[PDB]
Amino acid sequence: VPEAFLLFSRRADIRRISLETNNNNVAIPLTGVKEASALDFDVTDNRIYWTDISLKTISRAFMNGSALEHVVEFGLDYPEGMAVDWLGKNLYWADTGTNRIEVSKLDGQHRQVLVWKDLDSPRALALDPAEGFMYWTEWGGKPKIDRAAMDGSERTTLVPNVGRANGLTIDYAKRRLYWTDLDTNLIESSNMLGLNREVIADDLPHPFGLTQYQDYIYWTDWSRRSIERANKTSGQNRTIIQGHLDYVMDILVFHSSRQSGWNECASSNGHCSHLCLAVPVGGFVCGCPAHYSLNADNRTCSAPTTFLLFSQKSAINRMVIDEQQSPDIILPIHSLRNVRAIDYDPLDKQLYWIDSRQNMIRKAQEDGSQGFTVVVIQPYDLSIDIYSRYIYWTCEATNVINVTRLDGRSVGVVLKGEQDRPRAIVVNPEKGYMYFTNLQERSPKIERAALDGTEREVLFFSGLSKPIALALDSRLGKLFWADSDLRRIESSDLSGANRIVLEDSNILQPVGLTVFENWLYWIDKQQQMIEKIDMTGREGRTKVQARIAQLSDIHAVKELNLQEYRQHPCAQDNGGCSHICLVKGDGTTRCSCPMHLVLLQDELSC
Numbered sequence: 001v002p003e004a005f006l007l008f009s010r011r012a013d014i015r016r017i018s019l020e021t022n023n024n025n026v027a028i029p030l031t032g033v034k035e036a037s038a039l040d041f042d043v044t045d046n047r048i049y050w051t052d053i054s055l056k057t058i059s060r061a062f063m064n065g066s067a068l069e070h071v072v073e074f075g076l077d078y079p080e081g082m083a084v085d086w087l088g089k090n091l092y093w094a095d096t097g098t099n100r101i102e103v104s105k106l107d108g109q110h111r112q113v114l115v116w117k118d119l120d121s122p123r124a125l126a127l128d129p130a131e132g133f134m135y136w137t138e139w140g141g142k143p144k145i146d147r148a149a150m151d152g153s154e155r156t157t158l159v160p161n162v163g164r165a166n167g168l169t170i171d172y173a174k175r176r177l178y179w180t181d182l183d184t185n186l187i188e189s190s191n192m193l194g195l196n197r198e199v200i201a202d203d204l205p206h207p208f209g210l211t212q213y214q215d216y217i218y219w220t221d222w223s224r225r226s227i228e229r230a231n232k233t234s235g236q237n238r239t240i241i242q243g244h245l246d247y248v249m250d251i252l253v254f255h256s257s258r259q260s261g262w263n264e265c266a267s268s269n270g271h272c273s274h275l276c277l278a279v280p281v282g283g284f285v286c287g288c289p290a291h292y293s294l295n296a297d298n299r300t301c302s303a304p305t306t307f308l309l310f311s312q313k314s315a316i317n318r319m320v321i322d323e324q325q326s327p328d329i330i331l332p333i334h335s336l337r338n339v340r341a342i343d344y345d346p347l348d349k350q351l352y353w354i355d356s357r358q359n360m361i362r363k364a365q366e367d368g369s370q371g372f373t374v375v376v377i378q379p380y381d382l383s384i385d386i387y388s389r390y391i392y393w394t395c396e397a398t399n400v401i402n403v404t405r406l407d408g409r410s411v412g413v414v415l416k417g418e419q420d421r422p423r424a425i426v427v428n429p430e431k432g433y434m435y436f437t438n439l440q441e442r443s444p445k446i447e448r449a450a451l452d453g454t455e456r457e458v459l460f461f462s463g464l465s466k467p468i469a470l471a472l473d474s475r476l477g478k479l480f481w482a483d484s485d486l487r488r489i490e491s492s493d494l495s496g497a498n499r500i501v502l503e504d505s506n507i508l509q510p511v512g513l514t515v516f517e518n519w520l521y522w523i524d525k526q527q528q529m530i531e532k533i534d535m536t537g538r539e540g541r542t543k544v545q546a547r548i549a550q551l552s553d554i555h556a557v558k559e560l561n562l563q564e565y566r567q568h569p570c571a572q573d574n575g576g577c578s579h580i581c582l583v584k585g586d587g588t589t590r591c592s593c594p595m596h597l598v599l600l601q602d603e604l605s606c
């Protein structure tokens with residue numbers, strides 16, 4: 001029968017020492033760890049879990065060496081407490097920086113934020129999945145220990161009068177709570193309701209980490225560089241288990257008896273498609289990934305259909321206009337160095353961007369899986385034709401409008417000039433036109449052309465300086481843009497030019513804009529904020545979010561009506577065309593080519 005051992009983290013090392021013998025100090029054979037802190041485990045799985053406070057990630061590996069996976073890589077700021085729900089097979093964690101308690105599957109999937117309101121600085125975290133309750137300590141404001149159901153609901157404050165508590169442990173069998181008090185230098189205990197409180201040991205120079213096993217409590221002490229042990233009720237029989245161990249971060253006893261109990265999730269995941277979250281009354285509630293919604297069946301989840309995307313130098317973020325005002329999530333996308341522009345294909349659900357470092361057009365799914373480079377040349381802005389499956393983009397080095405198929409196959413250039421310096425671009429494949437910006441020497445223009453480069457016309461001469469971004473709404477029939485030097489956002493009609501200056505007031509440098517549903521969102525780089533304007537019966541200028549550092553682009557996504565999509569002529573096998581597909585006039589199809597080829601007699605091929 002496998003015996004119990006004690007896990008501890010210190011610097012880059014996670015080590016096991018055998019209890020009942022107090023030796024065999026071996027390290028778990030882990031690679032790539034810089035600074036380990038929070039520890040937990042899964043006995044049935046024989047897996048270990050840890051936090052890296054330096055790299056700001058959460059990882060797992062089999063005890064036996066490895067099947068090492070990074071389980072949470074993005075969105076952590078000051079990750080603190082971390083714990084395994086061994087029944088629902090979910091991973092919980094708390095973050096002091098972002099002020100959120102988050103959950104996900106043990107393999108990192110279906111990440112969801114459980115509590116984010118009224119949280120100051122969440123620290124220690126402890127789970128009771130048998131009873132469906134979670135417990136945490138908060139360090140900000142008036143320090144306290146809280147309780148809530150393991151879905152974030154039914155939140156109460158359990159211990160209102162404590163110092164900064166750090167070692168929060170449940171003794172599952174005897175129904176008690178234990179924590180270290182850093183301010184009062186003592187170990188305290190209470191029952192599950194935070195009553196019948198008692199101090200266990202008070203002569204403590206610097207207590208930090210804490211665990212409970214059988215009759216014993218275990219703690220680490222940074223002042224006397226030790227892992228110490230005592231009787232859980234009297235506090236007597238004090239012994240030094242390990243000395244000369246400075247800065248031991250977390251300790252835990254690994255044993256089957258520490259993960260006992262049962263709930264309704266332990267059997268086939270409560271039939272929930274994604275997350276099964278334990279609840280004190282009604283056993284369980286099916287949960288969903290962030291931004292996703294629970295269906296009528298109280299079982300399956302639906303992905304958000306209408307949302308907003310905004311990018312900065314190192315991250316693409318997604319936001320939704322929620323009833324509960326859900327927080328933004330940082331999309332888990334690898335190798336982002338300097339994002340300059342973004343777009344999104346609503347047909348295959350893929351995110352496209354351009355990295356100005358390594359100068360490439362890259363694409364991935366929202367979960368960060370389908371990673372693929374489309375264009376490998378100094379791209380500036382891009383715009384997707386969702387019907388022809390082409391991406392139109394502008395090159396800064398060659399000053400050209402280039403069109404590439406989504407799978408990376410080249411279609412060709414459609415516009416090049418000796419004087420032309422094309423920059424911002426947005427396509428309108430519904431009317432068969434593209435719109436763009438021309439940053440020519442001393443003389444800038446907002447232009448319009450056919451998707452092939454014909455029917456060119458200058459829409460605006462004066463009132464421009466350095467227009468930087470474009471947007472359009474095919475429903476209403478308007479074109480939007482933002483001027484960087486003049487700090488103003490203007491609006492006009494598609495074919496016509498009904499120039500309105502809707503905002504010109506409190507702006508520093510706008511760098512992006514899009515239309516959501518009936519709102520005009522934009523992004524200010526210096527002011528570091530997102531703002532929106534109402535298009536209909538005005539609700540007035542509204543602040544969306546501030547404190548966003550180095551933001552580059554903003555993009556709106558809408559639910560794609562599959563019935564309305566297949567009715568568009570150019571989506572029906574590109575209208576027969578080998579290259580460019582055009583719609584104009586009576587709403588029929590006409591083929592065209594890039595600049596190195598000509599249309600060939602059958603008016604179909606190049």
Ligand SMILES: *[C@@H]1O[C@H](CO)[C@@H](O[C@@H]2O[C@H](CO)[C@@H](O)[C@H](O)[C@H]2NC(C)=O)[C@H](O)[C@H]1NC(C)=O
Pocket residue numbers: 375377395398400402403404408409410411412413
């Ligand atoms: C238009 O885009 C294509 C890629 O979609 C560019 O073609 C590449 O050009 C480089 C030369 O600089 C070659 O090494 C690659 O093999 C080409 N890729 C292909 C053919 O898929 C092309 O340069 C762009 N056009 C202009 C005028 O810049």
Ligand SMILES: *[C@@H]1O[C@H](CO)[C@@H](O)[C@H](O)[C@H]1NC(C)=O
Pocket residue numbers: 045046062064065
């Ligand atoms: C590691 O552990 C797993 C499960 O216990 C096992 O399947 C695998 O063979 C082990 N690998 C070793 C011992 O190299």
Ligand SMILES: *[C@@H]1O[C@H](CO)[C@@H](O)[C@H](O)[C@H]1NC(C)=O
Pocket residue numbers: 215231232233234237
């Ligand atoms: C711990 O102390 C309690 C209370 O004095 C006692 O009942 C128990 O036997 C002790 N257990 C030990 C020393 O393992």
Ligand SMILES: *[C@@H]1O[C@H](CO)[C@@H](O)[C@H](O)[C@H]1NC(C)=O
Pocket residue numbers: 296297298
């Ligand atoms: C779950 O859906 C059922 C319909 O099957 C509905 O009656 C019920 O209100 C839902 N559950 C809860 C807890 O609201």
